[PDB]
Amino acid sequence: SLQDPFLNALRRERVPVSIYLVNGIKLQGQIESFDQFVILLKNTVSQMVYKHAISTVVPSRPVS
Amino acid sequence: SLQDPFLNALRRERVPVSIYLVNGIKLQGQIESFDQFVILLKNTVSQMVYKHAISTVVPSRPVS
Amino acid sequence: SLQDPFLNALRRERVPVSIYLVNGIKLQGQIESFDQFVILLKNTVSQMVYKHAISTVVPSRPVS
Amino acid sequence: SLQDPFLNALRRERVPVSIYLVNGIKLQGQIESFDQFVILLKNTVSQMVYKHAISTVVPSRPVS
Amino acid sequence: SLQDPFLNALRRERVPVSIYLVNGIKLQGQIESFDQFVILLKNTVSQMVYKHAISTVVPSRPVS
Amino acid sequence: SLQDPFLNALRRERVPVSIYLVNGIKLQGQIESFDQFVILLKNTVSQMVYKHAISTVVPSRPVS
């Protein structure tokens, strides 16, 4: 899988990301944690984001 | 899984949440119970929310 | 599962429900029968509702 | 399953149906045949309808 | 399955089709090839169409 | 499968593609890498695109 390495880096370097949902809605923050079903995104509070409703995950700066 | 621990806390502390559906529609209330397929949300009546139609689950205050 | 107990009660007490589809469209009537894939809803005619296109199931009065 | 009995009757009595897709779009005609994945609907030509994109199947008259 | 026979005929007789995506968007051309996940459609270039995002496949003339 | 050969060619010849998401949104760039779940697309930064939210993959020039 490539998801695990990719999300690991955003989580590890605490890189600010834009997650865009399948309806265009745009969420912003830092990936607190993830599992195969969900991604937890942190701003004021931790929200649970369902991967099945995610279209793309967009880092806000280049990530090694 | 992380869903189970996360939804357990909202259910246990009866934390008011905003569930946003895959079409932007915004539901509000308290998680009465959940299973892998569905989430029951309580306001005036208990409604059955299908997880596959959920985009994100947003607590209304920080949850341990 | 919780779906089976929940839909059983709406079907058994013939409780009028609003099923809202993943596109916001709102259907109304009584649950005639269900299986894991579909829900049959009755008004003038019986229509077949695919669960995968259901977002939430909303009873029109409290159900034990 | 209930789908098989339900779609069998529409196909067998050649009952005119409205299939509404997950985007609201409304298709009309008669069910030529079906399998678990798809439904063939007939008007001027036979079109292939993917069940995963179907929200509900609405007969145009009561069906035994 | 019925998909395989149906798509085989459109591909074999090089029948011009309209594929309508789950968002209403309408694509046109000829089916170059298919597998269970995807359909390749040809116009100026070959594009890869994901079946999960297809609502219906509409031939532009009757197909045996 | 046909996806693997098709995406391999876009990735190998570094062919500029338009990926259109299930909500019409149009993304552009080059396929950096892929796995069965996701496609990484490169412009200014590498973004993670979920295949389940992809409708079609459109090369910007004929690809052998």
**Closest partner CB to F48 (pick from A6, A60, A62):** A6
Listing DSSP states for chain E in one string gives: --HHHHHHHHHHTT--EEEEETTS-EEEEEEEEE-SSEEEEESSSEEEEEGGGEEEEEESS---
Residues 6+ apart with CB under 8 A from E47: E27, E40, E41, F56, F57, F58, F59
Give the one of F1, F52, F62 whose C-beta lies nearest to E52's C-beta: F52
Mutate to test the interface with F, among E20, E42, E48 (most CBs of F within 10 A): E48
Rounded Cα gap, residues B60 and A34, in angstroms: 21
Q: Do chains A and B touch (3 or more CB pairs under 8 A)?
A: yes
* CB neighbour class for D26 (10 Å; exposed up to 12, middle 13-18, buried from 19): exposed
Distance (Å) from the alpha carbon of B45 to chain C's nearest alpha carbon = 5
The Cα angle at residue A42 between residues A38 and A44, in degrees rounded to 5: 135
Q: Which residues of B touch C17 (CB under 8 A)?
A: none
Q: C-alpha angle C3/C51/C42, rounded to 5°?
A: 90
* Dihedral of the alpha carbons of F5, F6, F10, F15, in degrees to the nearest 10: 150
Structure token digits, residue A52: 């099945």
Please report which helix (H) or strand (E) contains residue F19, including its range: strand F17-21
Handedness of CA B46, B52, B58, B62 (dihedral sign): positive
Distance from CA of F7 to the nearest CA of E (A): 9
CA distance F44 to chain A (A): 8
Q: What angle do CA B31, B33, B39 make, to 5 degrees?
A: 70
CB spacing of A45 vs B24 below 8 angstroms:
no
Asked if A63 and F46 come within 8 Å (Cβ–Cβ), the reply is yes
| Method in brief | X-ray
Contact in structure between E19 and E30 (CB atoms under 8 Å) = no
Measured between beta carbons, the chain F residues lying within 8 angstroms of E44 are 62
- Contacts across the A-B interface (CB distance below 8 Å): 59
Domains, chain B, in order of start with CATH, read 1-64 (2.30.30.100)
- H or E element: which one contains D29? strand D26-34
Test E22 with F24 for CB contact under 8 angstroms.
no
What's the farthest any 2 CA atoms get from each other in chain D?
31
Entry resolution (Å): 2.3
